Design a protein around this ligand. Structure first.
Ligand SMILES: *[C@@H]1O[C@H](CO)[C@@H](O[C@@H]2O[C@H](CO)[C@@H](O)[C@H](O)[C@H]2NC(C)=O)[C@H](O)[C@H]1NC(C)=O
Lengths: 50, 50
């Protein structure tokens, strides 16, 4: 920057700029069946899971 | 699922508590001859351990 005690710079023109800002609002909602994942629909399993 | 007698207002996803399979099927290849247990166990002579 050129700096002086008696010097200033003043804009004689302007520019209009449009910019995009992206913010995540939500994430996928998920539900898990505990017996289906661990027992895999086994009758013998889930007796232990009680 | 809630382990409580009283239930409030909610969507309340629920774990399955119903029976589906009532039929049992066995599929095995066609084998008619019995295993030769008599040759394997009831043998006049047996090999030396070495
Ligand atoms: C400020 O800038 C704008 C452009 O960014 C200038 O407008 C231009 O003027 C020239 C003629 O001098 C034209 O040929 C261009 O087509 C114009 N641009 C647009 C987008 O219209 C404007 O003259 C400038 N103002 C000053 C004070 O210089």
């Amino acid at each position: 920057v050129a700096y002086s005690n008696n010097s200033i710079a003043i804009p004689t023109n302007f520019t209009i700029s449009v910019t995009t800002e992206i913010l995540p609002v939500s994430m996928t909602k998920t539900s898990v069946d505990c017996t289906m994942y661990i027992c895999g629909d086994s009758i013998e399993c889930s007796n232990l899971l009680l | 699922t809630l382990k409580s007698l009283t239930v409030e207002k909610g969507i309340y996803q629920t774990s399955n508590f119903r029976v589906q399979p009532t039929i049992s099927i066995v599929r095995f290849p066609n084998i008619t001859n019995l295993c030769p247990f008599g040759e394997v166990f009831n043998a006049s002579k047996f090999a030396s351990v070495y």
